[PDB]
Amino acid sequence: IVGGYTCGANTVPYQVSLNSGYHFCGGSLINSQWVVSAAHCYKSGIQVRLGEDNINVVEGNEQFISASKSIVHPSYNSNTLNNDIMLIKLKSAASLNSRVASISLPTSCASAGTQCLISGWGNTKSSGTSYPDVLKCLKAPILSDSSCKSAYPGQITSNMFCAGYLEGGKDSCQGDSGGPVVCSGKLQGIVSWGSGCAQKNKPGVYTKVCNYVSWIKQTIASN
Numbered sequence: 001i002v003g004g005y006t007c008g009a010n011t012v013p014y015q016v017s018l019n020s021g022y023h024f025c026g027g028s029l030i031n032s033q034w035v036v037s038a039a040h041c042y043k044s045g046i047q048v049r050l051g052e053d054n055i056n057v058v059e060g061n062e063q064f065i066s067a068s069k070s071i072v073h074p075s076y077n078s079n080t081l082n083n084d085i086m087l088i089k090l091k092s093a094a095s096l097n098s099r100v101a102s103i104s105l106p107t108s109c110a111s112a113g114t115q116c117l118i119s120g121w122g123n124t125k126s127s128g129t130s131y132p133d134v135l136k137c138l139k140a141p142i143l144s145d146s147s148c149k150s151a152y153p154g155q156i157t158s159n160m161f162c163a164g165y166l167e168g169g170k171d172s173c174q175g176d177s178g179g180p181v182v183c184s185g186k187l188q189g190i191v192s193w194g195s196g197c198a199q200k201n202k203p204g205v206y207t208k209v210c211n212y213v214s215w216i217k218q219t220i221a222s223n
């Protein structure tokens with residue numbers, strides 16, 4: 001998160017950390033045993049770290065669960081990042097309380113203009129490198145399909161939307177991938193890609209979760 005703020009410990013209770021010896025992606029808890037993430041975040045040996053604020057300190061509320069199975073979207077294209085969504089099944093059910101909670105899947109797509117919560121442990125600087133130990137939060141509106149398609153010609157599919165600010169200075173960034181974009185209490189986006197971070201006329205590009213509620217729900221009822 002570039003240009004955001006310190007969320008506060010456990011105030012984003014659906015935010016997870018993907019850990020393979022080190023934080024490498026975010027993810028979003030949607031029920032006690034399933035995390036949704038970015039498909040380009042896929043790797044073998046994933047442990048899912050719930051209840052995290054400082055990812056380099058044990059603080060009192062963590063749950064560490066190994067993945068038992070990962071499902072990259074059947075149609076994920078790593079070249080275009082089209083359909084950048086993946087589901088992770090947890091080996092044991094997380095124990096749900098006020099600091100470890102699932103976030104509701106949409107019944108509707110969020111409209112251009114709607115302001116959302118983007119959170120992650122990604123790089124906080126746009127020209128330079130610096131990674132936080134605590135979770136960082138950004139409120140960013142959704143942007144119109146017509147300025148999204150302009151900012152990134154030939155690259156925006158119906159499976160993506162842009163969210164952010166075209167004057168730059170505020171974005172998600174490397175290390176935020178897999179993580180939530182929440183609007184009106186609905187996991188609407190998944191941190192996916194962009195050109196740099198916090199750059200003018202280059203807003204964050206997010207996987208459009210509402211296209212995948214049918215794929216998510218029928219996957220989760222059969223696995």
Ligand SMILES: O[C@@H]1[C@@H](O)[C@@H](O)OC[C@H]1O
Binds near residue numbers: 080155
């Ligand atoms: O974003 C672009 C992607 O859509 C694809 O075309 O590969 C090149 C990238 O610049």
Ligand SMILES: O[C@@H]1[C@@H](O)[C@H](O)OC[C@H]1O
Binds near residue numbers: 062065
């Ligand atoms: O039991 C685990 C604890 O030992 C570890 O410190 O962090 C995750 C917990 O689930």
Ligand SMILES: [Ca+2]
Binds near residue numbers: 052053054055056059
């Ligand atoms: Ca911790």
